[PDB]
Amino acid sequence: KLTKRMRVIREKVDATKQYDINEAIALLKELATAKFVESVDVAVNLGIDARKSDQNVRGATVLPHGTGQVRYRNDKNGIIHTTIGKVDFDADKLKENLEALLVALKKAKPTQAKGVYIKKVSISTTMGAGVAVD
């Protein structure tokens, strides 16, 4: 069951509380623990009720830092999971990488979407815990 690798991961990440990007991307920099290069992943339990048909979103985004053109489509649970490059990329550039993702996410806000558009955004690597972004 639980192993030393997993208990040190949960010792490194205290996901019960929220974090800001400035130090949370440094938390991802220090969570990079694998023999092979990992890819940064971001999941938002976004507020659109894709269970409503008309609230579905299809979009695209070209990223300056590369991975550089990525696509995304909302699932039934209403959660966006996207990867926007490798883990060895610098924290600063990854910040504006997810910021470009975020603005491309806001530009497609459906008029039927009622409530908080972005319930929460979390970032996690291949073998890392989810750190909230503020």
CB of 4 to RNA, least distance (A): 6
> Please, which of residues 113-132 interact with RNA by CB under 7 A?
122, 124-130
CB of 94 to RNA, least distance (A): 15
Q: How far apart are CA 82 and CA 4, in angstroms?
A: 29
Q: Can you tell me whether residue 89 is helix, strand or coil?
A: coil
CB of 92 to RNA, least distance (A): 22
Find the binder of RNA among 12, 83, 91, 110 (CB under 7 A): 83
Find the binder of RNA among 58, 60, 69, 75 (CB under 7 A): 75
Q: Determine if 18 is a binding residue for RNA (CB under 7 A).
A: no
**Residue found by looking up tokens 């503020």 in the block:** 134
DSSP class of residue 45? E
Q: Determine if 35 is a binding residue for RNA (CB under 7 A).
A: yes
Q: Which residues of 30-65 are buried (b: 16+ CB within 10 A; e: fewer)?
A: ebbeeeeebebbbebebbbbbeeeebebeeebebee
Q: Determine if 111 is a binding residue for RNA (CB under 7 A).
A: no
CB of 91 to RNA, least distance (A): 18
Q: Which stretch binds RNA (CB under 7 A): 19-27, 58-66, 73-81, 95-103?
A: 73-81
Q: How far apart are CA 67 and CA 28, in angstroms?
A: 16
